[PDB]
Design a protein around this ligand. Structure first.
Ligand SMILES: Nc1ncnc2c1ncn2[C@@H]1O[C@H](CSCC[C@H](N)C(=O)O)[C@@H](O)[C@H]1O
Ligand SMILES: CN(C)[C@@H](Cc1c[nH]cn1)C(=O)O
Ligand SMILES: [Cl-]
Ligand SMILES: [Mg+2]
Ligand SMILES: [Mg+2]
Ligand SMILES: [Mg+2]
Ligand SMILES: [Mg+2]
Length: 307
């Protein structure tokens, strides 16, 4: 609660307004993201799923893990391919989902616990930039971070995250990391600006979160969804653009802020990767990439790495 107060105050009073994307993921937002994963324009989920379908047995063989830790786990739908391979290999003992959204952990924990009789479920609620120490150091761990969620951190915080995560890995542990790759810029923008309007609803939902949690009065349909490709930084950006001037009261903060007509507020970055740079970022964090896989079109990459 304090985290949200501080993030919203800092974000809305900055000259370039912004909100952190972790706050998209309340119950409504997590469900909207689940819908995003099945949009025709949003290739990341099905392409990473393709790689996992092909490579899960190999990944499990390489890792030899009895414990799957998943960061930003969400519904853990793709994760079931890894869990199935761990069960086939007679290795699976434990699943540790980690997420900021307590609801999605309760749902996924319940489902996975039932689908895999005899495995321990130990859900951890937290922010993966601050609370990795809540994850138990137990067993032989395959730590999984799918979806290119690592791209939702800009380069300095990403490097700090990776180094911190690397320092939690013991010998015998492995990191499986999904990274979305640089590609045609039209395909990229459309993946964040679908015909169905679902991404736009997901984006505007951060305003609903602030409205509810902090007693604010954002008018959601006064804000236009804008997805941009930033070619200098090689990242997708999501923005909310005020269609007309807006006066917003955030009552829990005793705060009033103004949006000019046309004023844009940054709600998310999604950094896109060049394959050879993924090796370098891992190495910088003290991790040796041991395997690299891509889908048949080269849209998406999956790394396995160790200390
Ligand atoms: N800072 C943060 N700390 C912990 N979880 C976060 C987070 N920011 C986002 N999340 C969670 O990470 C997930 C991002 S969406 C990705 C979901 C799923 N792993 C997939 O690959 O499809 C959501 O479940 C969201 O609630
Ligand atoms: C979760 N993260 C990987 C998504 C979040 C997202 C999807 N659409 C808009 N934002 C992405 O950056 O593609
Ligand atoms: Cl819009
Ligand atoms: Mg059996
Ligand atoms: Mg209005
Ligand atoms: Mg309205
Ligand atoms: Mg538009």
């Amino acid at each position: 609660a304090e985290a949200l107060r501080r993030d919203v105050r800092a974000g809305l009073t900055a000259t370039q307004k912004s909100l952190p994307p972790k706050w998209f993921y309340d119950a409504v937002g997590s469900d909207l993201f689940d819908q995003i994963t099945r949009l025709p324009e949003y290739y990341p989920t099905r392409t990473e799923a393709q790689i996992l379908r092909t490579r899960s047995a190999e990944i499990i063989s390489a890792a030899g893990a009895d414990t799957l830790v998943e960061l930003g786990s969400g519904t853990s739908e793709k994760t079931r391919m890894l869990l199935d391979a761990m069960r086939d290999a007679e290795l699976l003992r434990r699943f540790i989902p980690f997420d900021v959204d307590a609801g999605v952990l309760r749902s996924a924990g319940a489902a996975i616990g039932a689908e895999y009789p005899g495995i321990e479920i130990d859900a951890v609620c937290g922010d993966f930039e601050e609370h990795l120490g809540k994850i138990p150091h137990v067993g032989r761990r395959l730590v999984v971070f799918l979806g290119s969620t690592i791209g939702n951190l800009t380069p300095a915080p990403r490097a700090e995250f990776l180094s911190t995560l690397a320092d939690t890995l013991q010998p015998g542990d492995s990191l499986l990391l999904g990274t979305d790759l640089v590609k045609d810029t039209g395909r990229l923008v459309r993946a964040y600006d679908d015909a169905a309007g679902v991404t736009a609803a997901f984006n505007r939902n951060v305003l609903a979160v602030v409205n509810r949690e902090l007693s604010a009065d954002f008018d959601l349909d006064a804000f236009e969804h804008v997805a941009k490709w930033n070619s200098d930084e090689e990242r997708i950006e999501m923005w909310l653009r005020a269609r007309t001037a807006q006066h917003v009261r955030v009552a829990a903060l005793d705060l009033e802020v103004d949006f000019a007509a046309g004023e844009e507020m940054l709600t998310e970055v999604s950094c896109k990767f060049r394959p050879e740079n993924v090796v370098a970022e891992l190495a910088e964090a003290g991790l040796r990439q041991t395997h690299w896989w891509t889908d048949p079109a080269g849209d998406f990459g999956l790394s396995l790495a160790v200390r």
